[PDB]
Scaffold this motif. Structure first.
Motif, PDB file in Angstrom:
ATOM      1  N   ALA A  96     -19.479  -2.196  16.712  1.00  0.00           N
ATOM      2  CA  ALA A  96     -20.798  -1.722  16.351  1.00  0.00           C
ATOM      3  C   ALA A  96     -21.678  -1.368  17.552  1.00  0.00           C
ATOM      4  O   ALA A  96     -22.507  -0.474  17.456  1.00  0.00           O
ATOM      5  CB  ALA A  96     -21.488  -2.785  15.525  1.00  0.00           C
ATOM      6  N   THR A  97     -21.483  -2.065  18.662  1.00  0.00           N
ATOM      7  CA  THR A  97     -22.266  -2.051  19.903  1.00  0.00           C
ATOM      8  C   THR A  97     -22.139  -0.887  20.914  1.00  0.00           C
ATOM      9  O   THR A  97     -22.567  -1.034  22.070  1.00  0.00           O
ATOM     10  CB  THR A  97     -22.240  -3.441  20.547  1.00  0.00           C
ATOM     11  OG1 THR A  97     -20.890  -3.924  20.559  1.00  0.00           O
ATOM     12  CG2 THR A  97     -23.130  -4.423  19.802  1.00  0.00           C
ATOM     13  N   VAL A  98     -21.627   0.270  20.469  1.00  0.00           N
ATOM     14  CA  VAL A  98     -21.549   1.470  21.294  1.00  0.00           C
ATOM     15  C   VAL A  98     -21.812   2.656  20.394  1.00  0.00           C
ATOM     16  O   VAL A  98     -21.131   2.818  19.383  1.00  0.00           O
ATOM     17  CB  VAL A  98     -20.249   1.631  22.150  1.00  0.00           C
ATOM     18  CG1 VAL A  98     -20.185   3.004  22.809  1.00  0.00           C
ATOM     19  CG2 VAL A  98     -20.131   0.554  23.212  1.00  0.00           C
ATOM     20  N   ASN A  99     -22.802   3.495  20.772  1.00  0.00           N
ATOM     21  CA  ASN A  99     -23.131   4.691  20.010  1.00  0.00           C
ATOM     22  C   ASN A  99     -22.015   5.692  20.237  1.00  0.00           C
ATOM     23  O   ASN A  99     -21.717   6.035  21.389  1.00  0.00           O
ATOM     24  CB  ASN A  99     -24.487   5.254  20.400  1.00  0.00           C
ATOM     25  CG  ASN A  99     -25.056   6.212  19.380  1.00  0.00           C
ATOM     26  OD1 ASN A  99     -24.398   7.144  18.913  1.00  0.00           O
ATOM     27  ND2 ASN A  99     -26.312   6.026  19.033  1.00  0.00           N
ATOM     28  N   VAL A 146     -29.343   0.340  31.925  1.00  0.00           N
ATOM     29  CA  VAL A 146     -28.180   1.228  31.752  1.00  0.00           C
ATOM     30  C   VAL A 146     -27.350   0.763  30.567  1.00  0.00           C
ATOM     31  O   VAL A 146     -26.983   1.570  29.715  1.00  0.00           O
ATOM     32  CB  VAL A 146     -27.309   1.330  33.030  1.00  0.00           C
ATOM     33  CG1 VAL A 146     -26.085   2.224  32.805  1.00  0.00           C
ATOM     34  CG2 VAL A 146     -28.135   1.839  34.191  1.00  0.00           C
ATOM     35  N   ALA A 147     -27.105  -0.552  30.527  1.00  0.00           N
ATOM     36  CA  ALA A 147     -26.298  -1.288  29.578  1.00  0.00           C
ATOM     37  C   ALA A 147     -26.651  -1.101  28.110  1.00  0.00           C
ATOM     38  O   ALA A 147     -25.790  -1.339  27.263  1.00  0.00           O
ATOM     39  CB  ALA A 147     -26.297  -2.763  29.941  1.00  0.00           C
ATOM     40  N   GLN A 148     -27.898  -0.686  27.810  1.00  0.00           N
ATOM     41  CA  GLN A 148     -28.396  -0.450  26.451  1.00  0.00           C
ATOM     42  C   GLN A 148     -27.907   0.886  25.923  1.00  0.00           C
ATOM     43  O   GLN A 148     -27.770   1.044  24.719  1.00  0.00           O
ATOM     44  CB  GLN A 148     -29.923  -0.411  26.447  1.00  0.00           C
ATOM     45  CG  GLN A 148     -30.617  -1.628  27.039  1.00  0.00           C
ATOM     46  CD  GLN A 148     -32.093  -1.373  27.287  1.00  0.00           C
ATOM     47  OE1 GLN A 148     -32.652  -0.291  26.984  1.00  0.00           O
ATOM     48  NE2 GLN A 148     -32.756  -2.384  27.833  1.00  0.00           N
ATOM     49  N   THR A 149     -27.685   1.861  26.811  1.00  0.00           N
ATOM     50  CA  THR A 149     -27.278   3.224  26.464  1.00  0.00           C
ATOM     51  C   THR A 149     -25.892   3.595  27.058  1.00  0.00           C
ATOM     52  O   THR A 149     -25.542   4.784  27.115  1.00  0.00           O
ATOM     53  CB  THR A 149     -28.355   4.203  26.959  1.00  0.00           C
ATOM     54  OG1 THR A 149     -28.394   4.182  28.402  1.00  0.00           O
ATOM     55  CG2 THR A 149     -29.715   3.940  26.350  1.00  0.00           C
ATOM     56  N   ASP A 150     -25.125   2.592  27.533  1.00  0.00           N
ATOM     57  CA  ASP A 150     -23.796   2.849  28.093  1.00  0.00           C
ATOM     58  C   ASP A 150     -22.704   2.887  26.980  1.00  0.00           C
ATOM     59  O   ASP A 150     -23.010   2.768  25.782  1.00  0.00           O
ATOM     60  CB  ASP A 150     -23.462   1.903  29.289  1.00  0.00           C
ATOM     61  CG  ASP A 150     -23.174   0.409  29.032  1.00  0.00           C
ATOM     62  OD1 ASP A 150     -23.222  -0.034  27.848  1.00  0.00           O
ATOM     63  OD2 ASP A 150     -22.932  -0.325  30.018  1.00  0.00           O
ATOM     64  N   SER A 151     -21.447   3.108  27.399  1.00  0.00           N
ATOM     65  CA  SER A 151     -20.270   3.148  26.539  1.00  0.00           C
ATOM     66  C   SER A 151     -19.496   1.801  26.685  1.00  0.00           C
ATOM     67  O   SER A 151     -18.433   1.593  26.079  1.00  0.00           O
ATOM     68  CB  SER A 151     -19.388   4.324  26.947  1.00  0.00           C
ATOM     69  OG  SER A 151     -20.010   5.563  26.656  1.00  0.00           O
ATOM     70  N   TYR A 152     -20.072   0.888  27.490  1.00  0.00           N
ATOM     71  CA  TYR A 152     -19.483  -0.399  27.811  1.00  0.00           C
ATOM     72  C   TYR A 152     -19.945  -1.603  26.997  1.00  0.00           C
ATOM     73  O   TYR A 152     -21.099  -2.063  27.103  1.00  0.00           O
ATOM     74  CB  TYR A 152     -19.598  -0.716  29.315  1.00  0.00           C
ATOM     75  CG  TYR A 152     -18.616  -1.785  29.734  1.00  0.00           C
ATOM     76  CD1 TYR A 152     -18.857  -3.131  29.456  1.00  0.00           C
ATOM     77  CD2 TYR A 152     -17.408  -1.450  30.342  1.00  0.00           C
ATOM     78  CE1 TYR A 152     -17.914  -4.114  29.755  1.00  0.00           C
ATOM     79  CE2 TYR A 152     -16.455  -2.424  30.646  1.00  0.00           C
ATOM     80  CZ  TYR A 152     -16.714  -3.762  30.359  1.00  0.00           C
ATOM     81  OH  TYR A 152     -15.772  -4.741  30.650  1.00  0.00           O
ATOM     82  N   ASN A 153     -18.989  -2.172  26.272  1.00  0.00           N
ATOM     83  CA  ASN A 153     -19.108  -3.433  25.569  1.00  0.00           C
ATOM     84  C   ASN A 153     -17.708  -3.938  25.374  1.00  0.00           C
ATOM     85  O   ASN A 153     -16.789  -3.121  25.277  1.00  0.00           O
ATOM     86  CB  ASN A 153     -19.842  -3.331  24.260  1.00  0.00           C
ATOM     87  CG  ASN A 153     -20.238  -4.700  23.761  1.00  0.00           C
ATOM     88  OD1 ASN A 153     -19.409  -5.527  23.385  1.00  0.00           O
ATOM     89  ND2 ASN A 153     -21.505  -5.007  23.802  1.00  0.00           N
ATOM     90  N   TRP A 154     -17.524  -5.277  25.373  1.00  0.00           N
ATOM     91  CA  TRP A 154     -16.214  -5.872  25.106  1.00  0.00           C
ATOM     92  C   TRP A 154     -15.797  -5.497  23.680  1.00  0.00           C
ATOM     93  O   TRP A 154     -14.673  -5.020  23.455  1.00  0.00           O
ATOM     94  CB  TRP A 154     -16.288  -7.376  25.252  1.00  0.00           C
ATOM     95  CG  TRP A 154     -16.372  -7.881  26.652  1.00  0.00           C
ATOM     96  CD1 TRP A 154     -16.120  -7.192  27.795  1.00  0.00           C
ATOM     97  CD2 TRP A 154     -16.638  -9.232  27.041  1.00  0.00           C
ATOM     98  NE1 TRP A 154     -16.268  -8.014  28.879  1.00  0.00           N
ATOM     99  CE2 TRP A 154     -16.571  -9.278  28.449  1.00  0.00           C
ATOM    100  CE3 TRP A 154     -16.944 -10.413  26.331  1.00  0.00           C
ATOM    101  CZ2 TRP A 154     -16.804 -10.451  29.168  1.00  0.00           C
ATOM    102  CZ3 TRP A 154     -17.210 -11.563  27.041  1.00  0.00           C
ATOM    103  CH2 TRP A 154     -17.117 -11.585  28.439  1.00  0.00           C
ATOM    104  N   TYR A 186     -19.907  -9.142  29.253  1.00  0.00           N
ATOM    105  CA  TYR A 186     -19.839  -8.310  28.035  1.00  0.00           C
ATOM    106  C   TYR A 186     -20.675  -7.035  28.059  1.00  0.00           C
ATOM    107  O   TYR A 186     -20.207  -6.010  27.584  1.00  0.00           O
ATOM    108  CB  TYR A 186     -20.013  -9.120  26.726  1.00  0.00           C
ATOM    109  CG  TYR A 186     -21.428  -9.490  26.381  1.00  0.00           C
ATOM    110  CD1 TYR A 186     -22.028 -10.612  26.938  1.00  0.00           C
ATOM    111  CD2 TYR A 186     -22.173  -8.722  25.496  1.00  0.00           C
ATOM    112  CE1 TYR A 186     -23.347 -10.953  26.641  1.00  0.00           C
ATOM    113  CE2 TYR A 186     -23.488  -9.062  25.173  1.00  0.00           C
ATOM    114  CZ  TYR A 186     -24.075 -10.178  25.757  1.00  0.00           C
ATOM    115  OH  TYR A 186     -25.374 -10.539  25.491  1.00  0.00           O
ATOM    116  N   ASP A 187     -21.893  -7.091  28.605  1.00  0.00           N
ATOM    117  CA  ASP A 187     -22.711  -5.897  28.714  1.00  0.00           C
ATOM    118  C   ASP A 187     -23.267  -5.821  30.105  1.00  0.00           C
ATOM    119  O   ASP A 187     -24.479  -5.877  30.310  1.00  0.00           O
ATOM    120  CB  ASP A 187     -23.777  -5.766  27.601  1.00  0.00           C
ATOM    121  CG  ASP A 187     -23.942  -4.338  27.063  1.00  0.00           C
ATOM    122  OD1 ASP A 187     -23.639  -3.353  27.831  1.00  0.00           O
ATOM    123  OD2 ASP A 187     -24.378  -4.193  25.886  1.00  0.00           O
ATOM    124  N   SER A 188     -22.345  -5.803  31.079  1.00  0.00           N
ATOM    125  CA  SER A 188     -22.642  -5.687  32.499  1.00  0.00           C
ATOM    126  C   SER A 188     -22.025  -4.382  33.006  1.00  0.00           C
ATOM    127  O   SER A 188     -21.971  -4.121  34.211  1.00  0.00           O
ATOM    128  CB  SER A 188     -22.167  -6.918  33.257  1.00  0.00           C
ATOM    129  OG  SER A 188     -23.109  -7.963  33.079  1.00  0.00           O
TER     130      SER A 188
HETATM  131 CA   LIG Z   1     -23.303  -1.136  25.607  1.00  0.00          CA
END
Ligand SMILES: [Ca+2]
Ligand SMILES: [Ca+2]
Ligand SMILES: [Ca+2]
Ligand SMILES: [Ca+2]
Lengths: 1051, 341
Positions: free
Chosen positions: A452-455, A518-526, A861-863
């Protein structure tokens, strides 16, 4: 028949205002206000007491039998106590009583920083604290909380209705149960009669067995009752309301529908003869299939057929629907909002989705169009049939972005994608190719289901690779922050980040400040945030709109198994959902069957968050079915070889075993393992824990060896991160300036390590830190039995994982100022040798072979790409690239500064040295069947240790494995026995134990030469072994054309 | 016909013996012995504390929030705590808990001059202290509270027996209804059948109208049943005891005897023709008038005549008895003591 009505009493107004250095607690007496008679409040008393947490009290009585703390006054509404204080700051411990009996179940903690006035109010058995007597009274005389439990067709459990003269089940189909303008409960009801909790019920809900049982009338229409609201009401003989609460109905839903519902198939089942749509929604008033075009325009709206036996809704359409988008339009009462909600929801059984999982797609996973060439004839490269086959398992836990986000040799458009694994000529692909060749057998994929955590919309996302301008366009927050000036610069986010490093310090943590945004709008999440369990994630695909993801994912599986020759383990998260409630975008399950799929608090009905997030309920029949059906798809349609359950302790052992037997019918060699830590759900069911799973076949991660080798434990913060050294940080042997670890404390870590190396078995006998012969279960691990397993195949040993500090980072925190870069590289290898050369299943984090660093990030996780960077071009380990996240590592900044500059950052040479060592260890592991015995009985008959007892040399780990005649059969045709020697000490050591034994160093280690971990190991003709500092040796006993006596075990 | 029996679990034998300057408290886990899977006794803790009354404890935790006083070990039967003592004399204050919640309603006070062995056992919500795990286990799978109500000749009200496959009225004239050495309920019984609360009953006992109604057999000898003990028993299809409770009989006493009894005169009725002694005692096994001198020496002991319709006992003596002292010598089952007093 009596009408339930409100009490004719005005709303109260405190009566007493709390003054300086004194608090006031009001008891809002319900029994007192329902009565036109005066009350005797003598029996009422507060047990007040000072503790480390709440110490603001002034002179609290010590004696529990002391009932002397009677009310400081009273009125109609109830008594009050004027409590004297020491300080106007902090909090106080109040236990409200009527004699020597608690009136409020929970121990109250009155935080004066939460209630400014110090005038507070409480109701008996309420646990809650109110700022006013009014707020309390309203709560008391209202439908409040979800105290009642409809557990079966006939039974309603409610402690609040215990001994009450009037007990009823009020209901309303289209409205809320309430009191009218006259204060009367006019809504339809059912009369409840006192009964006893059924044997069947007590089994199902042990946590409610003590609750007061009530029998529903025989005329009760269970089905229509579950169509809307139900409220449990308790009233006086005269009908004055005592309590009104909401009802938790999951129990009855399982009892009324689950038997039938379990025998059906769910989703948009496209087969020969068309497509059957089926959704389980036993409470829904209405369900319709809404069919959408590719443009997401409505193409058809079809009301579904309800099966009364199951509460499942279905609709059959043509095979023309293959590829159509859809959602179910619900009409359902949600107890959280107390309303009959109307919304369109995606399928929980969706197998394909649109971008950002907005719409489910009708799909046929069996379609050649969704298969890479020769998918149908793809086999498991490594066997998993026997315990000995399983024991060979060598896991590399990887993440889709972590693998290809930084690799330049991977075509740009494939970076951070499933397809990156096809880039045969990349540093990453070729690296994995060599690791596979040296002995890494399995690839574990961190969340690849629908997160859910990546647009998934490209244009609502910006990554560090892209210009800083992009970051500001997507992120509103960046335009109004300390970095707003960079929106004008023609430099990338990556660029700006490297610039911030220059002045980054504990006092100026600028690198992490920008990263947070950056982490709020990135493609990075576990990705431990499930949206849909049975669909791949779309952001790891080139195009997330439609089926593209299915072919791409499969393409990655084929590449891993065929081109890289490794099996696949999928990390699974059934313990929670990303959200619940009728409003969250990501709530799917809780919008369809509200209050069913989620685990709710026994009193409030709030979705529990023990796991983080929204606790799921694998204990409920349909969710257990969902889990099994989900695993079936990943098993046969995705060709996954094994599954790792996130927070498996939250699942009932019975469910895990059920799913396992079910999945075994599709793939008999499937492996299940997970995190079997205590979840605190033992009140509810026998949890799937390390202890409880002994002999089941289900594996669990072992924290025993992990903590002994790494040092300390998780939750360590501040100087403890340095003070708590490990066997591999030099605990005892080479202490750091902050260390205070005793000789017995250090010897106990050796005891735990050895046990772990022998597959952490409950029945394995060994010589402890004091010289006593002890079973594995008899060796302590923080109050717990150290050893717990029946076979080593039930244990997963590790010294690094995605969660918590990287092995390198831990060594950087724990190593003595004296330990130079060269010894710390060997420290990493030594740490890893305990896992790699032990009987238990070897697991490790991707990057450990490249001294991976997260620059002290604990929960990465969101670094983003920045902290979770793995350089496959081998220039550095990503160490000292900025201060980690303030929120979670700020408390460790002073420790970081102390250690950060102690030693140089690794370079091409060090990373190459570590890769060589890693490949050595894995090669060794696959060099003999003696390393991977698989059966617990084989371990016990063949495995033993030397340099044991009270007199033991610290850091020396000596393991012997018998292949001699006293063990049984010759397992290795070339060997008679094995010796693993790990010298985790700065001083070189000697081995006279194998006096006159004819030994030789492994050919694997001899080939390695100067680059060997055994480099300098001396084996004298007279059987004496000289072990250099920070070294690992595999000494082998060659067999001579007949099985001789080898290294027999003793006791 | 099915025999009511205790669960197929052997009677426990302490497992831990209390040694010098240390006491041992056993929690007899009923939910734990009813088996299936192993139990987590982590949540279990004792709030131990020293006061003016019971001060024999050695280092008791002050913090009520302190759940650290977890079991010193466990087994099938339940956990146990090896409590360290200051003195082998006196007593200790124990509050048995599962988190920060009392398991036993009353604050326990373990008097070492009442339990010589210092090895004691307790059951959740029981308030009572047992010398053995056995004595506790027997008590756990036995007759507890007075939940049942014999409200009329034919009706027994009991919520505990609601929906249960086996519902019976066990009785014993001269002994307590119990389980034998084999854990079987061998005492005579009557089979109860589910019925609905009578209109007449609902009127009389509105506070019990919601209670589960059971019809007694037609062969039931109401009179002889009220001569001694009665116990309501609920059992499984197989006969494993679910519940055993004492019976409240005032309702049936009014229904069986009050009509007749109401029409009689009571006391030592000295009239013309002599003195009639009459006492209403419908449950008494025997009643005698004991006549005393002024010096309180027995002058006569006369067994009384029972009227079956009323349960009243009478005895007629001469007018010479004017001024004599007397008492009634009873032989009667008291449900508080469970004995024939
Ligand atoms: Ca993210
Ligand atoms: Ca997604
Ligand atoms: Ca709970
Ligand atoms: Ca051999």
């Amino acid at each position: 028949d009596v009408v339930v009505r409100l009490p004719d009493v005005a709303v109260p107004g405190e009566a007493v205002t709390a003054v300086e250095n004194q608090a006031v607690i009001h008891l809002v007496d319900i029994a007192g206000i329902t009565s036109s008679s005066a009350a005797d409040y003598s029996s009422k008393n507060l047990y007040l007491w000072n503790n480390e947490t709440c110490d603001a009290l002034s002179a609290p009585v010590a004696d529990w039998n002391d009932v002397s703390t009677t009310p400081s006054g009273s009125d109609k509404y109830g008594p009050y106590w004027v409590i004297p204080l020491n300080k106007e700051s902090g909090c106080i411990n109040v236990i409200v009583r009527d004699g020597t009996d608690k009136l409020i179940d929970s121990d109250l903690r009155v935080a004066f920083g939460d209630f400014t006035d110090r005038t507070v109010s409480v109701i008996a058995g309420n646990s809650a604290v109110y700022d006013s007597r009014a707020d309390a009274f309203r709560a008391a005389f209202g439908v409040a909380l979800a105290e009642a439990h409809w557990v079966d067709k006939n039974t309603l459990l409610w402690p609040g209705g215990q001994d009450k003269p009037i007990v009823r089940l009020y209901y309303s189909h289209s409205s809320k149960v309430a009191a009218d303008g006259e204060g009367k409960f006019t809504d339809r009801y059912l009369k409840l009669t006192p009964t006893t909790v059924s044997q069947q019920v007590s089994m199902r809900f042990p946590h409610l067995s003590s609750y007061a049982a009530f029998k529903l009338p025989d005329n009760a229409n269970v089905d229509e009752l579950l169509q809307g609201e139900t409220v449990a009401i308790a009233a006086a003989e005269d009908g004055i309301l005592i309590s009104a609460t909401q009802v938790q109905t999951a129990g009855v839903l399982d009892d009324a529908y689950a038997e039938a519902a379990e025998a059906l198939s769910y989703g948009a089942q496209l087969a020969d003869g068309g497509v059957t749509f089926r959704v389980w929604a036993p409470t829904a008033q209405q369900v319709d299939v809404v069919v959408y075009s590719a443009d997401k325009k409505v193409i058809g709206s079809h009301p579904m057929t309800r099966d009364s036996a199951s509460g499942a809704w279905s609709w059959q359409g043509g095979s023309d629907l293959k590829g159509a988008f859809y959602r179910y339009a619900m009409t359902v009462y949600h107890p959280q909002s107390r309303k009959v909600e109307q919304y369109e929801v995606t399928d929980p059984y969706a197998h394909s989705l649109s971008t950002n999982s907005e719409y489910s797609q009708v799909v046929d996973l069996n379609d050649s169009a969704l298969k890479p060439d020769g998918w149908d004839n793809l086999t498991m490269p490594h066997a998993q049939k026997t315990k000995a086959d399983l024991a060979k398992m060598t896991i590399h836990e990887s993440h889709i972005r972590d693998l290809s986000a930084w690799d330049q040799t991977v075509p740009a458009e494939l970076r951070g994608k499933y397809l990156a694994l096809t880039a045969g000529d990349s540093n990453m692909v070729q690296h994995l190719k060599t690791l596979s060749a040296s002995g890494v057998t399995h690839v574990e994929l961190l969340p690849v289901f629908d997160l859910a955590t990546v647009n998934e919309f490209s244009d609502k996302v910006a990554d560090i690779q892209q210009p800083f301008s992009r970051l500001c366009e997507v992120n509103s927050a960046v335009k109004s922050s300390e970095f707003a000036g960079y929106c004008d610069s023609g430099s990338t986010v990556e660029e700006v980040l490297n610039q911030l490093k220059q002045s980054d310090s504990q006092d100026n943590p600028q690198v992490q400040a920008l990263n947070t945004l950056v982490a709020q709008t990135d493609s990075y999440n576990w990705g431990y945030d499930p949206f849909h369990y049975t669909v791949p994630e779309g952001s790891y695909a080139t195009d997330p709109e439609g089926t593209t993801r299915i072919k791409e994912f499969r393409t990655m599986i084929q590449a891993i198994k065929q081109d890289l020759g490794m099996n696949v383990i999928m990390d699974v998260v059934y313990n929670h959902t990303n959200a619940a409630g009728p409003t969250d975008r990501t709530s799917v399950l809780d919008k369809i069957v509200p209050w069913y799929y989620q685990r709710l608090n026994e009193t409030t009905g709030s979705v529990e968050s023990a796991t983080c997030c929204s606790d799921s309920a694998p204990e409920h029949r349909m969710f257990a079915k969902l889990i099994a059906d989900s695993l079936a798809v990943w098993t046969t349609d995705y060709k996954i070889d094994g599954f790792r359950f996130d927070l498996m302790g939250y699942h009932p052992k019975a469910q895990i075993l059920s799913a396992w037997e079910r999945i075994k019918a599709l793939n008999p060699d499937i492996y299940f393992f997970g995190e079997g830590w205590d979840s605190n759900q033992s009140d509810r069911f026998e949890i799937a824990s390390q202890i409880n799973l002994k002999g089941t076949g289900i594996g669990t991660f072992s924290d025993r060896l992990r903590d002994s080798v790494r040092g300390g434990g998780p939750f360590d913060s501040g100087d403890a991160l340095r003070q708590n050294q490990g066997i591999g940080s030099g605990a005892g042997v080479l202490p750091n300036e902050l260390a205070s670890l005793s000789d017995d404390q250090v010897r106990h870590l050796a005891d735990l390590t050895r046990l772990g190396m022998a597959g952490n078995l409950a029945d394995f006998v060994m010589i402890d830190k004091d010289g006593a012969a002890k079973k594995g279960s008899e060796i302590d691990y923080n109050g717990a039995p150290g050893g717990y397993a029946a076979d080593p195949t039930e244990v997963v040993n590790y010294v690094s994982k995605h969660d918590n500090q990287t092995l390198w980072d831990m060594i950087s925190y724990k190593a003595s100022q004296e330990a130079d870069l060269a010894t710390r590289v060997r420290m990493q290898a030594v740490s890893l040798a305990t896992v790699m050369l032990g009987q238990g299943i070897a697991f490790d984090q991707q990057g450990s072979e490249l001294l991976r660093s997260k620059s002290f990030t604990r929960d990465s996780y969101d670094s983003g790409d920045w902290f979770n960077r793995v350089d496959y071009s081998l220039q550095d380990n990503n160490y000292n690239v900025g201060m980690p996240r303030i929120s979670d590592d700020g408390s460790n900044y002073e420790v970081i500064t102390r250690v950060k500059e102690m030693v140089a950052t690794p370079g091409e040479a060090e990373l190459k040295q570590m890769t060589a060592f890693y490949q050595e260890l894995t090669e060794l592991r696959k060099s003999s069947p003696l390393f991977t015995l698989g059966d617990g009985s084989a371990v016990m008959k063949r495995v033993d240790f030397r340099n044991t007892g009270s007199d033991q040399q610290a850091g020396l780990l000596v393991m012997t494995v018998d292949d001699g005649m006293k063990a049984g059969a010759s397992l290795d045709s070339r060997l008679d026995g094995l010796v693993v020697a790990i010298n985790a000490a700065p001083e070189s050591r000697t081995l006279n134990e194998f006096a006159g034994e004819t030994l030789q160093l492994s050919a694997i280690q001899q080939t390695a030469g100067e680059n060997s971990l055994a480099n300098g190991v001396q084996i004298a003709a007279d059987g004496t072994v000289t072990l250099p500092a920070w070294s690992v040796a595999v000494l082998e006993l060659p067999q001579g054309e007949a099985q001789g006596a080898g290294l027999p075990v003793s006791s």
